[PDB]
Amino acid sequence: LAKDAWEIPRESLRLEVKLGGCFGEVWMGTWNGTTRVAIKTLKPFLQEAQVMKKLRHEKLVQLYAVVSPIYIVTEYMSKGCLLDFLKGEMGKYLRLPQLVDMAAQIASGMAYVERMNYVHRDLRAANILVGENLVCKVADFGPIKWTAPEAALYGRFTIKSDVWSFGILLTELTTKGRVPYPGMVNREVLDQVERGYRMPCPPECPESLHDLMCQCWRKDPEERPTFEYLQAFLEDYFTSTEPQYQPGENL
Ligand SMILES: */C=C\C(=O)Nc1ccc2ncnc(Nc3ccccc3)c2c1
């Protein structure tokens, strides 16, 4: 087999609560008595896994250990997935300031991914974890509504198709987690997007933010901005772009 230094014995990990699981499971845990961990199990050819292993940033959930059945052990994110957090109870309270911040953190995790010349491929709220203090981190590196046309169609996945998903995740954030392209089914979305349709400005969301969404959704992957542009524009949002923002009923 020839394991690397990420490998531990199955006996080192103590599984406790179940937390969520179609293709496997997700548990809270304790690692050799001292350390709280999450544990992602798989249903019974890796690396692939060389991606979780080589990436290390503050806004990406940190791998701790892997096993061989196959287990993936990681830092524990206490608030679960962003999709659930947003449509749960602490969703009627989120306003644009908190939401753009959560958006700024994911852009930064993804800016790292970009400097490293990697691609995520399934960026969306279901794959962002939330911890204490509204910290967000990108997870689950390894459906078409989040996917850029050129990649749903021609397998052409790139950092720039990730940008596109980012823009879809922006509609998730600003709708408190609604499925995008509401009332449309996968085929209508593919057919309508190919023809130039784009989700309109979400209720109460500023135009300049919807405009960021539209940049993210350009037909030519190249004219989509970087995650580094995204990260910077989002962090500075309330001084440089909406200095006169005021809270409304929902945002
Ligand atoms: C959006 C669904 C989902 O994934 N929910 C979820 C709830 C609570 C969790 N706690 C801890 N970890 C995870 N997920 C996870 C995914 C990959 C690696 C580590 C943890 C979740 C997920």
Side-chain angles (χ1 to χ4, degrees), residues 19 26 38 40 61 74 76-77 80-81 83-84 125-126 129 139-140:
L19 280 168
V26 160
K40 211 262 167 93
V61 340
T74 70
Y76 183 72
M77 302 299 291
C81 68
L83 170 67
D84 297 347
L129 310 179
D140 294 316

Side-chain angles (χ1 to χ4, degrees), residues 19-20 25-28 37-40 61-62 72-85 124-130 139-141:
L19 280 168
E25 303 185 15
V26 160
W27 297 70
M28 194 174 88
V37 292
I39 312 143
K40 211 262 167 93
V61 340
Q62 185 58 67
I72 300 156
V73 184
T74 70
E75 106 199 65
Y76 183 72
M77 302 299 291
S78 63
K79 289 321 189 173
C81 68
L82 175 57
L83 170 67
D84 297 347
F85 186 78
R124 56 186 169 94
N127 280 337
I128 310 289
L129 310 179
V130 194
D140 294 316
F141 283 70

